[PDB]
Design a protein around this nucleic acid. Sequence first.
RNA 1: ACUCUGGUUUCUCUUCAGAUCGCAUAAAUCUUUCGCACUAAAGAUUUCCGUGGAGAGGAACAACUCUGAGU
Lengths: 216, 369, 152, 13, 141
Amino acid sequence: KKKTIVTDVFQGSMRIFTKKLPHPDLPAEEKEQLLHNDEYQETMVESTFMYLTLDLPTAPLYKDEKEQLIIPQVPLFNILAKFNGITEKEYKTYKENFLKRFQLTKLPPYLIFCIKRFTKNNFFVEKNPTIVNFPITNVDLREYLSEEVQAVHKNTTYDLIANIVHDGKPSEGSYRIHVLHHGTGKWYELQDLQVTDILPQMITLSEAYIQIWKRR
Amino acid sequence: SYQKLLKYYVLNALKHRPPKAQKKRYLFRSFKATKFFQSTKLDWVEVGLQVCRQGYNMLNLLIHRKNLNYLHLDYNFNLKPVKTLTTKERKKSRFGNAFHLCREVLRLTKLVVDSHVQYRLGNVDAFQLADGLQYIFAHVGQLTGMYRYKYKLMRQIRMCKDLKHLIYYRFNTGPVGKGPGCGFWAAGWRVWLFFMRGITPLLERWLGNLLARSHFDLELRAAVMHDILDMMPEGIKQNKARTILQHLSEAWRCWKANIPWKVPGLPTPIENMILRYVKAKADWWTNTAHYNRERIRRGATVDKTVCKKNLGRLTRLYLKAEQERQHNYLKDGPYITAEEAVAVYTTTVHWLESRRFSPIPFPPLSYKH
Amino acid sequence: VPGLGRGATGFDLNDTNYDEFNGYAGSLFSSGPYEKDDEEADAIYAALDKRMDERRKERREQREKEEIEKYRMERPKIQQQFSDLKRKLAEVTEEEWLSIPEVGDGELDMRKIGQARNTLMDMRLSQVSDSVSGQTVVDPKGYLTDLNSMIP
Amino acid sequence: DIESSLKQLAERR
Amino acid sequence: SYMLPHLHNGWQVDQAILSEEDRVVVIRFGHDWDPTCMKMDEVLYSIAEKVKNFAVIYLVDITEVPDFNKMYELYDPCTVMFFFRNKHIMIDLGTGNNNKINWAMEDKQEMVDIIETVYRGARKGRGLVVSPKDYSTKYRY
RNA sequence: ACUCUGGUUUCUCUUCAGAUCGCAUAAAUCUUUCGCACUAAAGAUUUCCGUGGAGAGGAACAACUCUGAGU
C-alpha cells in the first residue's frame, strides 16, 4: 500500500526527461550515429521525488567589487530553477556523459527540499557556505513545473514552514532548526533544548540545509 | 624452542585460509607435453649431481653474460670477486637480493647432493650420512648464509633451530648422551622444503625476467601547463607559454591572499582551467598544512624549512578563517541579543554603583603623576 | 663528439635502473642475437608459461578489473582532472588564443541586517545608558582649546 | 620550445 | 615546465660549459621523470631569475646524453654538479665527495647561498670551495 | 542356483570445487597498526607447493569372481 500518510503528505511526482551524450572523443559522424541510434536518446523516467535535492552552486572562492560581505549569496529561484525542464544537468557516469534534465510532474502538499551544502573535495570534505536567498512568505513552482499539466495543479503558492540549518564546521557542527510556528506568526528558532525567537528576515540569513514548505 | 614451535603452529593455523579453485594445470605435465623435454629414470644421487652442475652452469652464465668477468663462482656456489674493481664495476658487480638468495639455495642444494654422493661413494656410513643431513638442515643458516639475502628466512632458521633443539633434547637421553650422531632430519627437511616451495615463484620470476628477448602542487602545475601547452597552437606556444605560466602563478598567489584574480582579457575556458587548478592546489595545500600541523603537534621529526613553510601556511589559513568569521559576524549581525546585552549592562551598572567606583577621567592638563 | 673535447674527467649502472629486489633492471641477454630457432623456442616457452598461468587467470583478471573500476571512482589522474576543461579549452578561437595579456598587468544585502541589528542594540543600550547616575564626559573641544594654555 | 619537453615529460609520468 | 633549457646533446652541453666563463654553470644531471629531479627543477626555478645575473643553470637528461653519467660517474637520481671555465669546482659539502650535491635541496635560500659561495670560490680560483653549510648531516631536528 | 548393461590399471586434456579442497604449510603486494619491522600483528590480494569432483580421449589386460540388475 504505497498510499501511506508520509507518502501522501510529503512525496510528489517528478518527470525526469533525461538523456545521455554519445561521446566526448568522437567525430561528428560517430556522435550523430549514437544520437540517431537511440544510444543518446531522451527518455521519461518519471519517479516519486520525496525530497528535491536542490544543489547550491559552489562558492566562487574569489572576491569582487560588490558584496561587501564575502559570503556569496544566491537567490532561491535560480537555485530551484535547475529542476525545471529547460535547465539541463550532466551526470559524470562511468564511461558516459549522462546529460539529463528534470521536470516536476506533480507537487506534493508539503514539499521537502534539502540543499546539499556539503560536498567532498579531492582531499577533504568541505561545506559550501553560499546563502540561499529564499523568501519565506510566498513562492510558486509553476514557473518550473512541467508544461503538460501546468494548469492541472490549481494551487502553487507554497510557503516555507520549517528550515533546519547546520551551522559550524563540518566535523564539529551544530544543528539548529528555524521553524515557522502556526497559530501565531513568529518563526521561532529552536536549539537542542533552547527555544528562541528569530526575525523572519534573519531566517533567510542562516545557511539552510533542509527546508519543508507548505503549498497552502 | 617448544614455545616458538607452538607459536609457528598457531600462526599457521589461525591463517588457514581455504585454498582457491584452480583450473588444475600441471606445469610438469605441460613441460612433458613440450617437445623440448625428454624422459628417463636415474638415481637420486646422479640426478642431484647433474642438477648441481646445471645450477653452477646457470650461475656462470648469469655472472658471465653480463660482462662481469671480474668475479668467479666457486664449486661450492660461493661467488668471490677475482680482484679489485672500480665504482663503475662495483655497480656492475651489483648482485640482487634475489640473485643472492638463489645462490644460497643452490649452494645448499649442492651441499646436500654432494653429501648424498659421499654417502653413496663409501666416504661415510649411512648413520654418518643421516648426521650430515641433520647438520646440513639444522644449524645450516651459518653454513648457507641465506639470512642476509632475504631477512624473512630468519624465521625459518629459528624454526629449524627449535626443531633441532627438540630432536636433540628428546633423542639424546639415556645411554646416548650429547654428541654428533643425531640423524633425525625429517623436520628440518620439511621446513626447508616448505621454504623452498614458497621462495620458488619469486626466484623463477626473477630468472625469467632476466632472460628476455605529497607532491600534489608540482604535479598539478605540470599537468595544467602540459594541458595548456598542448591546447595552445604552435604560433602561440613560442612565447605565450611563459605568459600562461605567469597567469597561473598570479592566480595561485591570489587565492593564497584573499585578493581576487581578475584577468578580463583571458579566454573563458582559460579562466575556468586556471580556477580549477587553483581550487585543486588550494585543497592540496590545505590538506598538507593540516597534516603537517598534526605531525608537529604530535612530535614528528621536521626541519627548519618545513617548520617555516608549515607556519606560513597555517598563518595564511588562520587569517583567511578570521576574515571569513568577521564577514559572517557582519552578515549575521551581533551575536549577543539586545535583551541579554541590556540585562548585562544593568547588572554591571548595579555592581559599579554598589562598589561606588568613581570613573577614571581623561588625563588632566596638570596631572601630578 | 665525446666529452673529452671539454677537457673534463672524473672526480647502464644507474641507481634508478638498479634496485634491491631483482638487482638492476634490463635483460642480461641482449635482444640482438635472435633467429628463427630463437623464435620457435620463445614461442614454445611462452606457450608453456601461459598454460601454466591460466589456473586462476580468469577469476584473477575479473577481480582485478572490478578493483580497477572501483579505484577509478577515487583515483582520478591529474590528466583526467583537467581532461574535461582541456576538451572544452580547444574552443578558444585564434583571436582568443592570441589576445591573452601578459600577467604583469532583489539582491541580498548581507551587511544591511547586521547594521540594523547593531543600530537597534546601540539604541537600546543608550536608552539603558541614559539611566546612569554619574558617567563623566570631558569635552574634546575644551581640552584641545585649553591644551595650548600651558604651551611654551 | 618548452611545450614539447613538458609534454614529453608528462607522457612518461 | 622546466624553463631551464636542457642540453640534449652531450657535446652541446660541453660547449655550453665552454660558452660562459664569467659566471657559474650548473648542470642538473637528474632525469626529469623522477620526483626528486622535479623538486630540483623547482628549486632551480626558484633561483632561475635570481642567480641569473651571476650564473647560468642548465638541465640535463642522463638518458639523452649518457656520456656525462658514464665518464663523470653521476649515478645519483638527481646530482647537481658545477663547471666554471672548464674547471669543475668542488663544493665542500662534507658528504665524503664533492663532485655532486646528490640531495634534493628544498630550501631556496640554501641553494642561493651555495651558488654565491661557489661563484666566490671560482673567482678566487679555489677548486674546492668551502660550502658555508653543514651538509654532512641531515640538518633536521 | 538362470542370465545382464557393468573390468581394473595407466597416460593426457578441459571444467568445477570455501570440503580441514591439504589431519600439511610457504612466498609476494597493498592496506591498517604502534615504529624511530626476520626479530609484528590485522585485513585483503596474488603466484607457487598438489589435491579432490566430473567429463573427454588414449593403451594395457579381465571378462563376469564380484556386485547391481533382467529371476
